[PDB]
């Protein structure tokens, strides 16, 4: 290892005994990393791992999956720091203050999250406000994630304005397929709403002075039959997508909730209530499958970035073998730390020389 043991076994067990909250935690390194203290590491450093995807050129298939820089307050020191792109959001058109708190939970013993954060955002002006210049040229790759309000009326309409508010300065941008877990804006939950949020949404990007590749973010938990219509109508001609990422987090079990903190829910006697999103190593097997499952309806025709559970070499390896072409993380840069995005990197280009 050599400098990537020092945070997965001094460094970060000792930040989580100082602090207790996982959120607090977050806050505080993105703080970190919006003022540079954060460990550059040097680009051009895997000259067989640089891609081109979206005709755009990567270091390396390895960036930082979407919630961490919700604001685009630290996407710089995180392209400094190895990854090769971030995805920025998720920003809604009105900042937002998300569900009550404690929202985040630390699963040590699996290397695993369970949060139920409900887009906290500062809203498409302050964010994109910090993304304008784009100050990332030459430097990586930037992609929003849009979403809804929680209060809003026409989520589809959220949606359209997150495109036209980011489709100038984004390099890509994400929508997020709604999870069948609550009714929770799972008003888009059938075939035909994904279809015209779709349409209007291909509408509004064909407006922009370029084509911004529009990408479709879904959950590992649609069973086969809602899986090939998403794929079918994000492959349709009057409503075809760029790409698709696989995937977001699975709903946590009770017993799952329970070992980290996340179950019970202070002041919630029900007993159907959504815990939280269960990401890290225990998503690996699953989201990979649900890869790999995607992959093969698509039959290759979009690219898609593999996300979920990734905490070495041999996982990213695996997604891309399975039919991704970039991959993300999120959980691991947790419990690894910033060496985490060239560690894995470094692992793939062993992998491949055999
Ligand atoms: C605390 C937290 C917040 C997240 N916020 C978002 C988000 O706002 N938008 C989104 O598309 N995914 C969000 N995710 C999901 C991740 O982007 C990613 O899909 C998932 O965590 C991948 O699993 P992994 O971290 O184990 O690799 C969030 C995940 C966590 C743990
Ligand atoms: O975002 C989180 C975070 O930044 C933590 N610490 C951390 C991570 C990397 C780093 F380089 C320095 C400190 C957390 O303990 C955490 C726990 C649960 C959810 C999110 C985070």
Partial sequence: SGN??????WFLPTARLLVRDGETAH?????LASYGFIPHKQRNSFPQLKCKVFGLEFDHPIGLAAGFDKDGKAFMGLLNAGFSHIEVGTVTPNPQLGNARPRIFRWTEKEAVVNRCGFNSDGHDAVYERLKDRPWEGRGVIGVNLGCNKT?????????????????????????????????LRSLQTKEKLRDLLSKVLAARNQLSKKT?????????????????????????????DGMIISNTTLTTYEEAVACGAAPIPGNNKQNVVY???????????????????????????????????????????????????????????????????????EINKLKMT
């Fill in 4 to 9: 990537e043991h020092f945070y997965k076994d």
């Fill in 27 to 31: 806050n505080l390194s993105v703080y």
């Fill in 152 to 184: 809003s009326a026409d989520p589809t309409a959220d949606y359209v304005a997150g495109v036209r508010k980011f489709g100038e300065v984004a390099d890509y941008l994400v929508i997020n397929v709604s999870s069948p877990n609550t009714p929770g």
């Fill in 213 to 241: 590749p529009i990408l479709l973010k879904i959950s590992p938990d649609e069973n086969d039959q809602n899986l090939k219509d998403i794929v079918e109508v994000a492959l349709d001609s009057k409503t075809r997508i």
């Fill in 276 to 346: 939280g999103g269960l990401s890290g190593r225990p998503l690996f097997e699953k989201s990979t499958d649900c890869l790999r499952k995607v992959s093969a309806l698509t039959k290759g025709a979009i690219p898609l970035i593999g996300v979920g559970g990734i905490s070495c070499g041999e996982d990213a390896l695996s997604k891309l073998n399975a039919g991704a072409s970039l991959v993300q993380l999120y959980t691991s840069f947790v419990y690894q730390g910033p060496p985490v995005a060239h560690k894995v990197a470094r």
